[PDB]
Amino acid sequence: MSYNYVVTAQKPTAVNGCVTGHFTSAEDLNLLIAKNTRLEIYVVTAEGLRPVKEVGMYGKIAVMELFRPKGESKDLLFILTAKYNACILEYKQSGESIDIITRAHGNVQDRIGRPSETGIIGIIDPECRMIGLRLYDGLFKVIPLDRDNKELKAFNIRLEELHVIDVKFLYGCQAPTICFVYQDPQGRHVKTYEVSLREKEFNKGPWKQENVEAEASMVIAVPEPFGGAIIIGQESITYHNGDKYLAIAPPIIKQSTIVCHNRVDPNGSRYLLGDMEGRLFMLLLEKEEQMDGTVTLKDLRVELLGETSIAECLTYLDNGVVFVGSRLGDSQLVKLNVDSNEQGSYVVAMETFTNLGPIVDMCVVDLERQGQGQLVTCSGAFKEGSLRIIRNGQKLHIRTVPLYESPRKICYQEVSQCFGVLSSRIEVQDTSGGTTALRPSASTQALSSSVSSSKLFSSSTAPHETSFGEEVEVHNLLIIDQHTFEVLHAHQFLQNEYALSLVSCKLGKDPNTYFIVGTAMVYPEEAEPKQGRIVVFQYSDGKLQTVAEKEVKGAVYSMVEFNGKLLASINSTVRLYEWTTEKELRTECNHYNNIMALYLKTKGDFILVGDLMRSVLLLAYKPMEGNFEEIARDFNPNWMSAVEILDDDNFLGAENAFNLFVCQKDSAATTDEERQHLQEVGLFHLGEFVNVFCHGSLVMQNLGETSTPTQGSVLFGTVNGMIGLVTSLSESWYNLLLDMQNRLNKVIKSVGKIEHSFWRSFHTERKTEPATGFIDGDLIESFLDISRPKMQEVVANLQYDDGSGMKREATADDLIKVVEELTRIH
Amino acid sequence: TKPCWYWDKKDLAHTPSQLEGLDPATEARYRREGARFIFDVGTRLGLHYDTLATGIIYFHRFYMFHSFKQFPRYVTGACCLFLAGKVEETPKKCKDIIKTARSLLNDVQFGQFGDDPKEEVMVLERILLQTIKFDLQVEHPYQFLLKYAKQLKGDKNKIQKLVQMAWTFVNDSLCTTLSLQWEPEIIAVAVMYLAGRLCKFEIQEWTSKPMYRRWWEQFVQDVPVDVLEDICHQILDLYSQGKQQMPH
Amino acid sequence: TESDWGKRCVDKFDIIGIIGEGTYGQVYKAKDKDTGELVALKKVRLDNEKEGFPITAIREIKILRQLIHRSVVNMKEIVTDKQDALDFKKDKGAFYLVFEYMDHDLMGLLESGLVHFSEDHIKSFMKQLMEGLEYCHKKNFLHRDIKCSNILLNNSGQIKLADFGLARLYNSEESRPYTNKVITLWYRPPELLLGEERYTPAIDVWSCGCILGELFTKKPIFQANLELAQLELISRLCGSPCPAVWPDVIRLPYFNTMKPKKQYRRRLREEFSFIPSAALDLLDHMLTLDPSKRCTAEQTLQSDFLKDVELSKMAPPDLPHWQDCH
Ligand SMILES: CC[C@H](CO)Nc1nc(NCc2ccc3ccccc3c2)c2ncn(C(C)C)c2n1
């Protein structure tokens, strides 16, 4: 068996959702921000936000909504986790003591059901009579909000429309009414149903089905006076209410997909709309009063306000202060002005909240020779793309390097005192037949620049037609100084060539240090790339020189230096190249029993391969024979997102289900079959998507004791910005910390009353296994935050083992010292 | 696709056994003794008649490729029965076959098994499988005797007498190389034909074509009486050579 | 000739790698040096010599040389390790069962979560499987290990059944004693959970029905660890076994022993209401408690769901091979 420990070095930073309400007091205005597994509670002031409370939940926050049922003084909060843990929460404050109350809780998972394409949707009635959940195709789940439903028991109503895009409860209806956009073979339509708690079924809705735009994406519930709904698409915005139908199709919104909406004026007169290019719009409802005294919607208007960070969630708060909750870039507070500035914009940034964004890749480098290490991340996407320099100093100090284009891979080249970074920018087919970039960015603002003139694929004869307005990716290799982070050089790859892998190394007997890039020729027609390049560059005297190119019959997904040779993965094939005295790559040996060789790691003559679906395979280079040999494979099927070698026997992997596992050689060599079986000894649900695993640590280790129970250091970056660390334990130390976890889980009160053991259980749509081989360091590190009575309750009857003393009782003060040492590695 | 498992009578003059100096009578004797050894061992163990026949067919085929002087026949027989049990889903442990083989064989005969009987048998299974070309599925006259008899309608007792007499002739034919000369379908017809002559029955009357004097043609196409008579002659030769007489 | 099996050496195949772990030996991917055909080799080791050549392999050899159908895996030949020269006693080399290589196995596609089946995709999948099962059933063979892993899919969309290690002939005339624990618990029929021991070919139909439901949910229907818990899950969906729906349930060894928590009513149509009507009717008939009332393979092919499915229009599963990296 294997024993490992996982801690969070940086908590998730990307904003997944934000709501405004009166949660902490019926008097205050609150903003609740939901980062993955973390809830942040703020109070709105005239300058900005006052933080008041933050809690963690043992689950990814999927639905977060505020409601105030009749009889309550203040808003209550509903949170549903991605594993279907539901709960209703209340804020309670006693002087200086702030705590969160779990008013109702339960798990609403159905034994049988198909998870929907558009994900979990949760909505609440305007009269707070029920919670609507869209969890599975063809079903609508209702949790009625009666006083007695403390377990959140619910029933399903059959829903004929299997493919629902979005559903929201409508305002201004006699009985609970849902408006949903759904898709069937005839296109997309908007339909309404009524929800009867007494009959537990749908009844016919207030207004007829209407066919809507093919890409109708979002449903807006318009409050009275207007009533009805607004449906946002790619080209048009439509209002539907009974007989009335309006449609505005302004050309400005066709340019970029609108992803978020928020209400500004409670009367429904004004809404905010945001799009993927970061633009912020105002949607205006023009009122017309009839002599009857009724107010009808006269027209719709869309007005461009300015630019924000590419926003996942928008919240208007009060005054002109809008909170831009971003998942791909930094979140923001911005102020909307009545008068535009001299550039024509009504939006001026107030504050910027750091978001490490998607961490596509990262490396650890000692820039100052401090014997510490600094973490350089490829963070963000599109106009939010950046590099982030991260060091320990008690908080993390983070420098941001804006690129305004997507960073893909990073590798450090000390000889050149610079970084090599792969990046891609979006250009659009223009009337010249070529393409035009939407904004200047790192690859266009380089000091010196170059473009591949390779003739490898120039024979073409394969037609690829272009339509005006279509997007393309343009890929570049950026040479960036390690001190100024100035883009010294930008090399642009071939049209339709994607840069997928990057290394910096010396090969063979060649004293030169090269940047080597693996690419793939990507055409929309192809299911899987069938052409690619390995390119050897040399960065010398401010210019990048193309040294050699090797044509391959696939995508070079991963490369790594291997004992002076170049190890590259081309589709299924894993290949080892030698670097000749003629400065060309020469194939030595190949391995072909793969589905798709997405990831490669090495140690000595051993190679770890990560497959798209066949988990991880341990290969070995046999120098006596000049070829590969399969040592062992993890025959259990997992979709890999990243891999890493812990030691000669233990191997770490991350699954696309937000799970981590460790495989070991069976080390019971009585039969060849046992040796070739990698056994999954560790299983753990991280809750994050791990893009990159990197050996290293950010703690200051020079001139220090640097002694800890833990051995080893692997850092990993995730899509939500979370950075974590995996380290190894001895059997004795694991058992102590594991036994302590079981004791802590009985003592510590969970938000929503979610069992910790459940949360960390390995989970896919098809399996759920109890965690094994992993200590939740974030749980262990919480021992230092629980009250003294609880600490002493935890240590009761706790014995140590395999120590100098076989059995040794633990005191509260003894464990405080142990945990504090564990806090020193992160 | 599939191998050919039938030889001409004339070809049996050139088995490995014959060419190593064994005369035709001796090889015929060895085949009877090996087959009957298989039959007796498996009967003591309670084995289905198909399992006994399958082992015997493996045995007969084996010695079309090997000589009796280099492969002791009772070891081969025991191995054939051991494999037959697994093929026909009537498995037996090799130790139990040895135990029974020892009970039935004298001291000289059991000498063939050498110092370690089980090992000599288990080791041979490799050669057996390669010899029979991994063609394990075998059909036997029994299923055709019953399939064809079911299509006869008439006096219940005369037909049952026909079947049992023919069934006995099938059991007796396993001691011969007929298994190597004619498909089982033909064997089943030949034994029905022989029992009919011995019982003075006119089988055509029991068929759906009572005026079709060559009654068997509706069961087995393209079979001349010559073939059925050759089979009948060879079966009765066993009875005449021995002291046993036709069952009747 | 092509029929002289067991003599050709495994030297004739370049071994690419180890695809999986088998019952009687590991399974390897290989390429024929002469033709370039990718083949799958199942290693049979008789060196254990506890009871000689494994019966599991004997069954697969015996049966698969008889069965010829598009939806049944083809055994191409049997090859051997370099044999010891003139020393058959010392020869401990193994034999290899040569099979056609299949790109993927259903479990792998589903567990990785890398496949989506539309109604049309499921029609093409089930028709091939049930036609293959019918071929086997018309030939009176029972698979007895139908599980997602044993169903094998090529990227074209051709479906082939594979592991016949537990297959045995079925006689309606002569009831025979059979082994009670045959199929994986998740795909095991209720009759065998109660210990039938004389089971029908409808055991394989139940398993295929569990797969049918799974293809619409991407999750197995009856996931349990213990035989009783499995009967409980089946009962929650299909209804509790009782003479009202299964007159002969009272004859089964464990009927009185393994009672479910309640005498549940059948809800299969309610919990599967998101399934298309033709499929729900097929599922309802395939997941019938009483094996003598459970539909046959032929009856499934004469259903509104699979009857008019044109097999020429192969309709492959939607498997992503790019953009899955990022
Ligand atoms: C019998 C157990 C196996 C494993 O589950 N099943 C199995 N799997 C086959 N291919 C799918 C497959 C499975 C695993 C892989 C791993 C890496 C790379 C490629 C892989 C491909 C296959 N091809 C042909 N056969 C014959 C033997 C019927 C097969 N038997």
For residue A280, what are its two tokens? 């912020």
State the first-to-last Cα distance of chain B, in angstroms, to the nearest integer.
Answer: 43
**Which H/E stretch holds residue A331?**
strand A331-336
Helix axis angle, B156-173 relative to B141-149, nearest 10°? Answer: 170
Same domain, B13 and B132: yes
Q: Which residue of C has its CA nearest to B136?
A: C62
Residue partners of A146: CB distance under 8 A and separation at least 6:
none
B137–C1: do the CB atoms touch at under 8 Å?
no
DSSP secondary structure code for residue B234 in this structure = H
Same domain, C87 and C135: no
Give the Cβ contact number of residue C52 at 10 Å: 21
- What CATH number does the domain containing B78 carry? 1.10.472.10
Distance CA A13, CA A36 (A): 8
Q: Are A724 and A715 in contact (CB under 8 A)?
A: yes
Distance CA A554, CA C35 (A): 24
Q: Are A331 and A15 in contact (CB under 8 A)?
A: yes
List chains touching A (3+ CB pairs under 8 A).
C
C19 lines ligand 1 (CB under 6 A): yes
Distance CA A284, CA A28 (A): 28
Instruction: Put residue A564 in one of left, alpha, beta given phi > 0 → left and psi -120 to 50 → alpha.
Output: left
Q: Indicate the residue among C75, C100, C125 that finishes a domain.
A: C100
Same domain, B33 and B45: yes
Q: Are A812 and A795 in contact (CB under 8 A)?
A: yes
Q: Are C87 and C14 in contact (CB under 8 A)?
A: no
Distance from the alpha carbon of residue C154 to the mean position of ligand 1, in angstroms: 11
Distance CA C167, CA C141 (A): 6
Same domain, C248 and C163: yes
Distance CA A639, CA A652 (A): 13
Q: Are A477 and A517 in contact (CB under 8 A)?
A: yes
Which residue's C-alpha comes closest to atom 3 of ligand 1? C20
β pairing state of A723-728 and A711-718: antiparallel
Same domain, B110 and B165: no
Q: Are B81 and B128 in contact (CB under 8 A)?
A: no
Q: Tell me which residue in A527, A633, A639 faces C18 most closely, judged by beta carbons.
A: A633
> Quick check: C36 contacting A, CB < 8 Å?
no
Alpha helices, DSSP H only, in chain B?
A: 16-19, 24-44, 49-62, 73-87, 94-104, 107-110, 117-131, 141-149, 156-173, 184-199, 225-241
Same domain, C122 and C207: yes
**Which H/E stretch holds residue A623?**
none
**Which H/E stretch holds residue A730?**
none
State the first-to-last Cα distance of chain A, in angstroms, to the nearest integer.
Answer: 25
For residue A790, what are its two tokens? 């609880």
Q: Are A673 and A735 in contact (CB under 8 A)?
A: no
CA triple B72-B73-B74, angle to 5 deg:
100
Q: Indicate the residue among B94, B109, B137 that finishes a domain.
A: B137
Mutate which: C38, C48, C111, vs A, most A CBs within 10 A: C111
Those residues of chain C whose CB sits closer than 8 Å to some CB in chain B are: 1-7, 46, 49, 51-53, 55, 58, 61-62, 65-66, 78, 80, 88-89, 91, 95, 168-169
> Quick check: B70 contacting C, CB < 8 Å?
no
Burial class, C147, CB count within 10 angstroms (exposed 0-12 / middle 13-18 / buried 19+): buried
Give the Cβ contact number of residue B247 at 10 Å: 15
Which residue pairs, CB below 8 angstroms and at least 24 apart, start in A42-45? A44/A20, A44/A317, A44/A318, A44/A321
Q: Are A652 and A604 in contact (CB under 8 A)?
A: no
Q: Which residues of C are annotated as a binding site for ATP?
A: 19-27, 42, 100-105, 326
Q: Do chains A and B touch (3 or more CB pairs under 8 A)?
A: no
Give start-end residues of each CATH 1.10.150.910 domain in chain A. 731-823
DSSP secondary structure code for residue A184 in this structure = E
Distance CA A680, CA A633 (A): 10
- Neighbouring-strand partners of residue A49: A44
Give the Cβ contact number of residue C245 at 10 Å: 15
> Quick check: C20 contacting A, CB < 8 Å?
yes
Distance CA A131, CA A125 (A): 7
Distance CA A519, CA A551 (A): 10
DSSP string, A471-540: EEEEEEEEEEETTT--EEEEEE--TTEEEEEEEEE--TT----EEEEEEEE--TT-SS---EEEEEEEEE
Distance CA B140, CA B57 (A): 9
Q: Which of A129, A213, A138 is nearest to A177 (CA)?
A: A129
Q: Among positive and negative, which fits the CA dihedral B143, B148, B151, B154?
A: negative
**Which H/E stretch holds residue A741?**
helix A731-747
| Omega before A225 within 30 of 0, i.e. cis | yes
Which residue pairs, CB below 8 angstroms and at least 24 apart, start in A734-743? A734/A3, A734/A773, A734/A775, A735/A801, A736/A800, A736/A801, A737/A5, A737/A775, A737/A780, A738/A775, A739/A798, A740/A780, A740/A783, A740/A794, A740/A798, A740/A815, A741/A775, A741/A776, A741/A779, A741/A780, A743/A794, A743/A795, A743/A798
Q: Which of A229, A235, A375, A346 is nearest to A282 (CA)?
A: A346
Distance CA A496, CA A759 (A): 43
For residue A234, what are its two tokens? 């790619």
Domain encompassing residue C91: 10-100
Give start-end residues of each CATH 2.130.10.10 domain in chain A. 4-353, 359-728
Residue partners of A323: CB distance under 8 A and separation at least 6:
A18, A31, A33, A49, A314, A315, A317, A331, A332, A333
Same domain, B97 and B130: yes
Same domain, B142 and B127: no
A766–C219: do the CB atoms touch at under 8 Å?
yes
- What CATH number does the domain containing C155 carry? 1.10.510.10
DSSP secondary structure code for residue C276 in this structure = -
Quick one: resolution in A? 3.4
Distance of CA C284 to the CA centre of its chain: 20
Unique residue bearing structure tokens 């996982």: A6
CA distances (Å), A592 to each of A324, A522, A531, B173, C38, in order? Answer: 48, 22, 17, 55, 12
B130–C80: do the CB atoms touch at under 8 Å?
yes
For residue C313, being part of any structural domain is answered with no
Give the Cβ contact number of residue A57 at 10 Å: 23
Distance of CA A174 to the CA centre of its chain: 41
Q: Which CATH class is domain A359-728?
A: mainly beta
Helix axis angle, B73-87 relative to C55-64, nearest 10°? Answer: 70
> From which experimental method does this structure derive?
X-ray
Distance CA A528, CA A1 (A): 38
Distance CA B118, CA B98 (A): 7
Q: Are C297 and C205 in contact (CB under 8 A)?
A: yes
User: How many residues are given for chain C?
Assistant: 326
The listed CATH number (3.30.413.10, 3.90.1170.30, 2.130.10.10, 1.20.120.530) that belongs to domain A4-353? 2.130.10.10
Q: Tell me which residue in A114, A557, A676 faces C325 most closely, judged by beta carbons.
A: A557
Distance CA A177, CA A166 (A): 14
For residue C229, what are its two tokens? 């818990």
C221–A677: do the CB atoms touch at under 8 Å?
no
- Cβ-based contacts of C61 with chain B (< 8 Å): 134, 136
Residue A176 half-sphere exposure toward CB, CA atoms < 13 A: 24
Same domain, C26 and C149: no
DSSP string, C56-93: HHHHHHHHHTT---TTBPPEEEEEEPPPPTT-TTT---
Instruction: Put residue C24 in one of left, alpha, beta given phi > 0 → left and psi -120 to 50 → alpha.
Output: alpha
Distance CA A168, CA A126 (A): 10
Q: Are A101 and A89 in contact (CB under 8 A)?
A: yes
Distance CA C115, CA B133 (A): 41
Find the Cα–Cα–Cα–Cα dihedral B143, B146, B150, B151, rounded to 10°.
Answer: 70
Find the Cα–Cα–Cα–Cα dihedral A429, A432, A435, A436, rounded to 10°.
Answer: -110
Q: Are A549 and A454 in contact (CB under 8 A)?
A: yes
- What CATH number does the domain containing C85 carry? 3.30.200.20
Distance of CA B84 to the CA centre of its chain: 13
Q: Among positive and negative, which fits the CA dihedral A491, A497, A500, A504?
A: negative
CATH T-level fold of A731-823: DNA polymerase; domain 1 (1.10.150)
C53–B127: do the CB atoms touch at under 8 Å?
no
β pairing state of A487-492 and A386-392: unpaired
DSSP string, B135-198: ------HHHHHHHHHTT--S-HHHHHHHHHHHHHHHHHHTTSGGGGTS-HHHHHHHHHHHHHHH
Same domain, C44 and C151: no
Same domain, C66 and C147: no
Q: Which residue of C has its CA nearest to A139?
A: C274
**Which H/E stretch holds residue A447?**
none
Q: Starting at the edge strand that comes first in sequence, how are the strands of the sheet with A76-81 ordered?
A: A61-67, A76-81, A85-94, A97-107
Same domain, B59 and B164: no
Distance CA B128, CA C315 (A): 46
Q: Are A525 and A560 in contact (CB under 8 A)?
A: no
Q: Which of A250, A381, A233 is nearest to A304 (CA)?
A: A250
Torsion angles phi and psi, residue C169, rounded to 5: -75, 145
Q: Indicate the residue among B137, B158, B177 that finishes a domain.
A: B137
Distance CA C66, CA C62 (A): 7
For residue B50, what are its two tokens? 């198909």
Torsion angles phi and psi, residue B118, rounded to 5: -60, -45
SS3 A222: coil
Domain encompassing residue B237: 138-248
Burial class, A595, CB count within 10 angstroms (exposed 0-12 / middle 13-18 / buried 19+): middle
C13 lines ligand 1 (CB under 6 A): no
Please indicate whether residue C11 is annotated as part of the active site.
Answer: no
Residue A336 half-sphere exposure toward CB, CA atoms < 13 A: 21
Same domain, B93 and B125: yes
Distance of CA B47 to the CA centre of its chain: 15
Q: Indicate the residue among C81, C100, C119 that finishes a domain.
A: C100
Q: Among positive and negative, which fits the CA dihedral A194, A196, A197, A199?
A: negative
β pairing state of A678-685 and A690-695: unpaired
Distance CA A549, CA A526 (A): 23
Q: Are A736 and A725 in contact (CB under 8 A)?
A: no
Q: Which residue of A has its CA nearest to C220?
A: A766
Q: Indicate the residue among C73, C100, C127 that finishes a domain.
A: C100
**Which H/E stretch holds residue A367?**
none
C149 lines ligand 1 (CB under 6 A): yes
Helix axis angle, B225-241 relative to B184-199, nearest 10°? Answer: 70
**Which H/E stretch holds residue C280?**
helix C277-286
- Neighbouring-strand partners of residue A562: A565
Same domain, B112 and B156: no
Q: Which of A224, A255, A221 is nearest to A239 (CA)?
A: A221
Q: Are C199 and C207 in contact (CB under 8 A)?
A: no
Same domain, C181 and C228: yes
**Which H/E stretch holds residue A449?**
strand A448-451
DSSP secondary structure code for residue C15 in this structure = E
Structurally, how many domains does chain B consist of?
2
Our separate counts of H helices and E strands in chain C read: 9, 10
SS3 A328: coil
Same domain, B17 and B126: yes
Unique residue bearing structure tokens 């599975």: A136
Q: Which residue of C has its CA nearest to B96?
A: C51
Q: Starting at the edge strand that comes first in sequence, how are the strands of the sheet with C104-105 ordered?
A: C104-105, C152-153, C159-160
Tell me how close the Cα of C215 comes to any Cα of chain B, in angstroms: 35
At A334, the amino acid letter reads: V
C88–B127: do the CB atoms touch at under 8 Å?
yes
Which residue's C-alpha comes closest to atom 11 of ligand 1? C104
SS3 C260: coil
Torsion angles phi and psi, residue C237, rounded to 5: -95, -50
Q: Indicate the residue among B94, B115, B137 that finishes a domain.
A: B137
Same domain, B58 and B116: yes
Same domain, C79 and C133: no
Distance CA A580, CA A589 (A): 15
Structurally, how many domains does chain C consist of?
2
Which residue's C-alpha comes closest to atom 2 of ligand 1? C20
For residue C76, being part of any structural domain is answered with yes
Q: Which of C56, C152, C58, C42 is nearest to C97 (CA)?
A: C42
Same domain, C46 and C68: yes
Same domain, B32 and B77: yes
Distance CA A806, CA A784 (A): 26
Tell me how close the Cα of A232 comes to any Cα of chain C, in angstroms: 27
A194-233 burial, b if ≥16 CB within 10 A, otherwise e?
bbeeeeeebeebbbeeeebbeebbbbbbbbebbbbbbbbb
CA distances (Å), B238 to each of B57, B171, B234, C42, in order? Answer: 18, 12, 7, 46
Distance CA C248, CA B132 (A): 45
Torsion angles phi and psi, residue C251, rounded to 5: -85, -10
Alpha helices, DSSP H only, in A361-428?
A: none
Q: Starting at the edge strand that comes first in sequence, how are the strands of the sheet with A30-35 ordered?
A: A15-21, A30-35, A38-44, A49-56
Distance from the alpha carbon of residue A621 to the mean position of ligand 1, in angstroms: 25
SS3 A267: coil
Distance CA A416, CA A514 (A): 10
For residue C214, what are its two tokens? 């799974």
| Residue C97 Cα: closest atom of ligand 1 | 27
DSSP secondary structure code for residue A405 in this structure = S
Same domain, B69 and B152: no
B2–C65: do the CB atoms touch at under 8 Å?
yes
CA distances (Å), A389 to each of A400, A572, A803, in order? Answer: 7, 35, 41
